[PDB]
Amino acid sequence: SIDKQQIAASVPQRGFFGHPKGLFTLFFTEFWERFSYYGMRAILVYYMYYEVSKGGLGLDEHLALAIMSIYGALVYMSGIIGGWLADRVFGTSRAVFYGGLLIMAGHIALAIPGGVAALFVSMALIVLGTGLLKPNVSSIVGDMYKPGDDRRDAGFSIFYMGINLGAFLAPLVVGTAGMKYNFHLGFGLAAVGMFLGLVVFVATRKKNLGLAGTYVPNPLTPAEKKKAAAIMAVGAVVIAVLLAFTVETFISLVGILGIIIPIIYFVVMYRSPKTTAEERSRVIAYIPLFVASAMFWAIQQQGSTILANYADKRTQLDVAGIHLSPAWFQSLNPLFIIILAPVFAWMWVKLGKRQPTIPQKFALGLLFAGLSFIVILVPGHLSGGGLVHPIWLVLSYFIVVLGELCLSPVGLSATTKLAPAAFSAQTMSLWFLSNAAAQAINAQLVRFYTPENETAYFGTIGGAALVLGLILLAIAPRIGRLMKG
Ligand X SMILES: C[C@H](N)C(=O)N[C@@H](C)P(=O)(O)O
Q: Which residues bind ligand X (CB under 6 A)?
A: 38, 72, 167, 304, 330, 333-334
Least separation in angstroms between residue 138's CB and ligand X is 14
Q: Specify the residue, 297 or 458, whose C-beta has the smaller distance to ligand X.
A: 297
Contacts 24+ apart (CB under 8 A), 332-338: 332/394, 332/397, 332/398, 333/167, 333/303, 333/397, 333/400, 333/401, 334/163, 334/164, 334/165, 334/167, 334/168, 335/168, 336/397, 336/398, 336/401, 337/164, 337/401, 337/404, 337/405, 338/164, 338/165, 338/168
Least separation in angstroms between residue 253's CB and ligand X is 21
Contacts 24+ apart (CB under 8 A), 405-412: 405/337, 405/340, 405/341, 405/344, 406/344, 406/361, 406/362, 406/364, 406/365, 406/368, 407/292, 407/293, 407/296, 407/361, 407/362, 407/364, 407/365, 407/366, 408/365, 410/358, 410/361, 410/362, 411/293
Q: Specify the residue, 315 or 435, whose C-beta has the smaller distance to ligand X.
A: 435
Q: Specify the residue, 251 or 327, whose C-beta has the smaller distance to ligand X.
A: 327
Least separation in angstroms between residue 62's CB and ligand X is 20
Least separation in angstroms between residue 164's CB and ligand X is 6
326 touches 46 (CB < 8 A): yes
Q: Specify the residue, 41 or 417, whose C-beta has the smaller distance to ligand X.
A: 41
Q: Specify the residue, 171 or 370, whose C-beta has the smaller distance to ligand X.
A: 171
Least separation in angstroms between residue 72's CB and ligand X is 6
Least separation in angstroms between residue 331's CB and ligand X is 8
Picking from 128, 131, 114, the residue whose alpha carbon sits closest to that of residue 48 is: 114
Least separation in angstroms between residue 34's CB and ligand X is 8
Name the amino acid, one letter, at 328. Answer: W
Residue 24 CB partners (closer than 8 Å, separation 6+): 15, 16, 204, 208
Phi-psi region of 344 (alpha: psi -120 to 50; beta: other; left: phi over 0): alpha
Q: Specify the residue, 38 or 310, whose C-beta has the smaller distance to ligand X.
A: 38
Q: Specify the residue, 38 or 423, whose C-beta has the smaller distance to ligand X.
A: 38
C-alpha angle 369/429/210, rounded to 5°?
A: 120
Phi-psi region of 20 (alpha: psi -120 to 50; beta: other; left: phi over 0): beta
Q: Specify the residue, 28 or 35, whose C-beta has the smaller distance to ligand X.
A: 35
Least separation in angstroms between residue 188's CB and ligand X is 20
Q: Specify the residue, 111 or 407, whose C-beta has the smaller distance to ligand X.
A: 407
Q: Which value, to the nearest 10 degrees, does the dihedral of the CA atoms of residues 308, 393, 313, 435 take?
A: 30
71 touches 123 (CB < 8 A): yes
Least separation in angstroms between residue 85's CB and ligand X is 21
